[PDB]
Design a binder for this molecule. Structure first.
Ligand SMILES: O=C1C[C@@H](c2ccc(O)cc2)Oc2cc(O)cc(O)c21
Ligand code: NA
Length: 159
């Protein structure tokens, strides 16, 4: 079955620039700006659109070794990005996939709002726990804040 979790957070970076950096260039940026959160990102197959598979490795001492993520949809107009965790980490005999949807919306102050949905698809019925959801949220926030700091400090990056 499916467990749905939604959250929202804000950024001081305009939506299109944040989407270009945080979403479209995370493979380069995450290991650079948050090496204590993501050790590397490997492109396994695909050229960035639907179906592209990446292997995200975590640093030593993290709960999980890696996950493989698959790009589902990339909407460059509406700043929507859908991707799924399809192997590694929590995926296995209790959890088949985690489907994620991010939407970045502009705010008139020149920042943005990120709307995030995480859908856990379980095999049989193995409750998803609050700590697993919390860990995902914390990781996404850490990565967001690291990218935001980089964008603030490198004005010529990503426009
Ligand atoms: O669940 C996620 C996904 C994460 C993320 C987005 C895009 C990407 O390419 C990789 C990770 O962003 C987030 C940012 C948050 O503040 C809280 C979150 O829960 C999340
Ligand atoms: Na999350």
């Amino acid at each position: 079955g499916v467990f749905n979790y939604e959250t929202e957070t804000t950024s001081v970076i305009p939506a299109a620039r944040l989407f270009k950096a945080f979403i479209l260039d995370g493979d380069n940026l995450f290991p650079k700006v948050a090496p204590q959160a993501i050790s590397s990102v490997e492109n396994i197959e695909g050229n960035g659109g639907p179906g592209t598979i990446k292997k995200i490795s975590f640093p030593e001492g993290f709960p999980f070794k890696y996950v493989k993520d698959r790009v589902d949809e990339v909407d460059h107009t509406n700043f929507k990005y859908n991707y799924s965790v399809i192997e590694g980490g929590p995926i296995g005999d209790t959890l088949e996939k985690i489907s994620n949807e991010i939407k970045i919306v502009a705010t008139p102050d020149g920042g943005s709002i990120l709307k995030i949905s995480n859908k856990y698809h379980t095999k049989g019925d193995h409750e998803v726990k609050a700590e697993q959801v919390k860990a995902s949220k914390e990781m996404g926030e850490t990565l967001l804040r690291a990218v935001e700091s980089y964008l603030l400090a490198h004005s010529d990056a990503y426009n």
